[PDB]
Amino acid sequence: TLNGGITDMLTELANFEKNVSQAIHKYNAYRKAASVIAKYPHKIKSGAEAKKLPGVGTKIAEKIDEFLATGKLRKLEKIRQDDTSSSINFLTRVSGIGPSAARKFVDEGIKTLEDLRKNEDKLNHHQRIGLKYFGDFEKRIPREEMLQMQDIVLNEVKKVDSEYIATVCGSFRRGAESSGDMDVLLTHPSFTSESTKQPKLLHQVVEQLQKVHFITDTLSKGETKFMGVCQLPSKNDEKEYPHRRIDIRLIPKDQYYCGVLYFTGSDIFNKNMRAHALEKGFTINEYTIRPLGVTGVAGEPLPVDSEKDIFDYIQWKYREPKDRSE
DNA sequence: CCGACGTCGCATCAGC
DNA sequence: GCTGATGCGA
DNA sequence: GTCGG
Ligand SMILES: Nc1ccn([C@H]2C[C@H](O)[C@@H](COP(=O)(O)NP(=O)(O)OP(=O)(O)O)O2)c(=O)n1
Numbered sequence A: 001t002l003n004g005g006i007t008d009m010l011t012e013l014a015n016f017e018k019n020v021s022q023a024i025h026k027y028n029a030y031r032k033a034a035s036v037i038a039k040y041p042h043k044i045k046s047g048a049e050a051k052k053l054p055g056v057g058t059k060i061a062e063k064i065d066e067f068l069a070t071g072k073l074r075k076l077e078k079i080r081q082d083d084t085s086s087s088i089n090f091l092t093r094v095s096g097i098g099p100s101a102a103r104k105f106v107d108e109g110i111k112t113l114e115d116l117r118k119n120e121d122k123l124n125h126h127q128r129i130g131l132k133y134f135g136d137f138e139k140r141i142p143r144e145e146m147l148q149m150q151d152i153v154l155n156e157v158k159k160v161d162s163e164y165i166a167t168v169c170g171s172f173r174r175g176a177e178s179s180g181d182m183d184v185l186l187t188h189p190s191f192t193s194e195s196t197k198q199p200k201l202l203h204q205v206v207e208q209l210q211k212v213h214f215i216t217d218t219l220s221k222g223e224t225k226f227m228g229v230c231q232l233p234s235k236n237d238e239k240e241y242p243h244r245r246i247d248i249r250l251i252p253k254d255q256y257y258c259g260v261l262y263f264t265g266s267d268i269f270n271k272n273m274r275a276h277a278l279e280k281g282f283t284i285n286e287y288t289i290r291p292l293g294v295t296g297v298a299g300e301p302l303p304v305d306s307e308k309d310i311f312d313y314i315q316w317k318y319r320e321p322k323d324r325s326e
Numbered sequence B: 001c002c003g004a005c006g007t008c009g010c011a012t013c014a015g016c
Numbered sequence C: 001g002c003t004g005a006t007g008c009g010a
Numbered sequence D: 001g002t003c004g005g
């Protein structure tokens, strides 16, 4: 946290632009600047020093000057005092409520936690669950609890079919001492890029985890992606664990390396890596890495036998998961 | 300066 | 019901 | 908001 004050300011600006201004490219701009500054190993002394870094331009340099001199940013101080901005910024903290819905709710005079709770019939299913567990979803998950959760998921998955492989990804795989949620990558030999020899492969696992009361709620669910809620079991006379977000992603087994690269993140790392790929004449998704012809159309999937192979194509030196937390 | 600036899954809706 | 666009999130 | 061509 060498430059915590600065990165916090930039993150709050990013959130404002995303949630209120609905300007995704400014949100992206601020987050890149925040990220490059976060990994800068010097305590920043000026906006000039910061401007040297890629992603930090004139405007953010000027803000860093103001922040260093005063400890505040007038632009943010005003935003914090704005009723519409503050309301919209709050409502978007509910999972399922984005920038559009938040502004619509404010229009209708729904703008506090209390208002949401007395207007549950105006929320869609995802939003209703997000409201239910608003408190819990704000809390972080200790790695110790993540390990307990991993143990349950892997063992229950094994009970269904021993040929499943479940891999916890996200911040957990990057070695984080705490995580915002649990991300699970799932493969099974019956589901490949070439065919699906067994239906309900994701559904069966979800079902089993519901059966043992680990999964408690469902935000969304399709053939390959589950977004939901889970909870560790507690002992006698013990206060219950908080409910936690869990995502499960079924990926073609022959496409594991692209899938695990994607689901390990970070999100900024993926954006930066996929951007670099384009510059080098490739495109990367959770399934494949493909070349781009002079056309601009993706060609055929290139051979991949490790995460490192993907780095090799775009001429990046390999980076272990723990070094991908951008 | 100016056009690009990651990529996709699921839920929901408008139009037909 | 289908198609395609939009919102939201990973 | 930043910046490579
Ligand atoms: N916009 C996004 C968001 C996430 N992702 C990919 C990699 C992320 O690590 C995988 C899981 O998303 P996530 O759970 O929201 N973030 P992550 O697990 O890294 O951190 P926390 O869950 O601890 O907050 O998202 C992405 O590629 N683009």
Ligand SMILES: [Mg+2]
Pocket (backbone or CB within 6 Å): A170, A171, A179, A180, A181, A182, A183
């Ligand atoms: Mg996560």
Ligand SMILES: [Mg+2]
Pocket (backbone or CB within 6 Å): A170, A181, A182, A183, A246, A247, C010
């Ligand atoms: Mg997640």
Ligand code: NA
Pocket (backbone or CB within 6 Å): A050, A051, A052, A053, A054, A055, A056, A057
């Ligand atoms: Na710069």
Ligand code: NA
Pocket (backbone or CB within 6 Å): A091, A092, A093, A094, A095, A096, A097, A098
């Ligand atoms: Na939200």
